[PDB]
Amino acid sequence: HSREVLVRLRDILALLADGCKTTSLIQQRLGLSHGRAKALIYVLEKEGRVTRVAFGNVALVCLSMDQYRQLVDGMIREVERLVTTNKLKFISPPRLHDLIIKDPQARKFFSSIIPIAHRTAIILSFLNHLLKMIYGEPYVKTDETVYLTANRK
Ligand SMILES: [Cl-]
16 A cells, blocks of 8 residues: 555554544544545455444444444443433433533543544434433434333343
8 A cells, every 4th residue: 555545544453453433533533534534444344454333323443343342332331330320210312421421431431432522413313322222212202312221121
């Protein structure tokens, strides 16, 4: 590869060594345009070095499906810790976002996966997908989704 491509491919793989990340986080961390980041991730995918896993409307870039499963296990443990600590009987994407950004450990963890600082449509969709994976289909479906924590699994 060219100097720019070789260095960037190397950098993306290094960034992923510590865990799966969204393309948005990769772009931000490495100062890449959307197009360059996507093109580079494509090259890595064709080379067998990464896998793209759909996670709602975002894609997670992972070194392996094992790495993905580790990420999911971690995200699930963090959500369940926040639910337990706050004794929650129900949860919604905005409420989960708020618990994450207010808890230093959760905030550090999630911000190493996806931009999380601001309550955007994107992050709400991401957290909604996570909640649905943990608790199944929501009890309240329109406007703000509400999940019953009793429905875990
Ligand atoms: Cl090249």
